Amino acid sequence: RNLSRYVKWPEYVRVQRQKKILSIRLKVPPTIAQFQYTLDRNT
Amino acid sequence: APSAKATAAKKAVVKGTNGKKALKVRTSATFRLPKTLKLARAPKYASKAVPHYNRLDSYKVIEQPITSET
């Protein structure tokens, strides 16, 4: 069995992954979050 | 319809086909420090630049013969 979800990761790794999770899950003002209505690619 | 072909194409044009991940097997519960490069010293200067000489040469070791009767 591969147990990649079960491992004890390092600390800063835990911080940054949880941080991105948190910034996802948080309600946001409209001032920021005009960011990530950001530009597409070919342009 | 689902238009699965065309929404795949949508995802293609909007992300640019760089859309999968190389999933790594990770089996150890604990992750450890990677074994990395470890040099040895190249001093620009020596520590004292002169070796001290033989501290403990023989003429200094042997102080004396005893001259007693036993």
Curated annotation (Swiss-Prot), chain A:
It comes from the Eukaryota. Coiled coil: none annotated. It is found in: Cytoplasm. Present with 238000 molecules/cell in log phase SD medium. Component of the large ribosomal subunit (LSU). Mature yeast ribosomes consist of a small (40S) and a large (60S) subunit. The 40S small subunit contains 1 molecule of ribosomal RNA (18S rRNA) and 33 different proteins (encoded by 57 genes). The large 60S subunit contains 3 rRNA molecules (25S, 5.8S and 5S rRNA) and 46 different proteins (encoded by 81 genes). Belongs to the eukaryotic ribosomal protein eL8 family. Component of the ribosome, a large ribonucleoprotein complex responsible for the synthesis of proteins in the cell. The small ribosomal subunit (SSU) binds messenger RNAs (mRNAs) and translates the encoded message by selecting cognate aminoacyl-transfer RNA (tRNA) molecules. The large subunit (LSU) contains the ribosomal catalytic site termed the peptidyl transferase center (PTC), which catalyzes the formation of peptide bonds, thereby polymerizing the amino acids delivered by tRNAs into a polypeptide chain. This is Large ribosomal subunit protein eL8A. It comes from Saccharomyces cerevisiae (strain ATCC 204508 / S288c). The lineage of its organism: Eukaryota, Fungi, Dikarya, Ascomycota, Saccharomycotina. The chain holds residues 44 to 86 of 256 of the full protein.
Curated annotation (Swiss-Prot), chain B:
The gene is RPL25. It is found in: Cytoplasm. Belongs to the universal ribosomal protein uL23 family. Component of the large ribosomal subunit (LSU). Mature yeast ribosomes consist of a small (40S) and a large (60S) subunit. The 40S small subunit contains 1 molecule of ribosomal RNA (18S rRNA) and 33 different proteins (encoded by 57 genes). The large 60S subunit contains 3 rRNA molecules (25S, 5.8S and 5S rRNA) and 46 different proteins (encoded by 81 genes). uL23 is associated with the polypeptide exit tunnel. This is Large ribosomal subunit protein uL23. The chain holds residues 2 to 71 of 142 of the full protein. Component of the ribosome, a large ribonucleoprotein complex responsible for the synthesis of proteins in the cell. The small ribosomal subunit (SSU) binds messenger RNAs (mRNAs) and translates the encoded message by selecting cognate aminoacyl-transfer RNA (tRNA) molecules. The large subunit (LSU) contains the ribosomal catalytic site termed the peptidyl transferase center (PTC), which catalyzes the formation of peptide bonds, thereby polymerizing the amino acids delivered by tRNAs into a polypeptide chain. It comes from Saccharomyces cerevisiae (strain ATCC 204508 / S288c). There is a cross-link at residue 60 (Glycyl lysine isopeptide (Lys-Gly) (interchain with G-Cter in SUMO)).
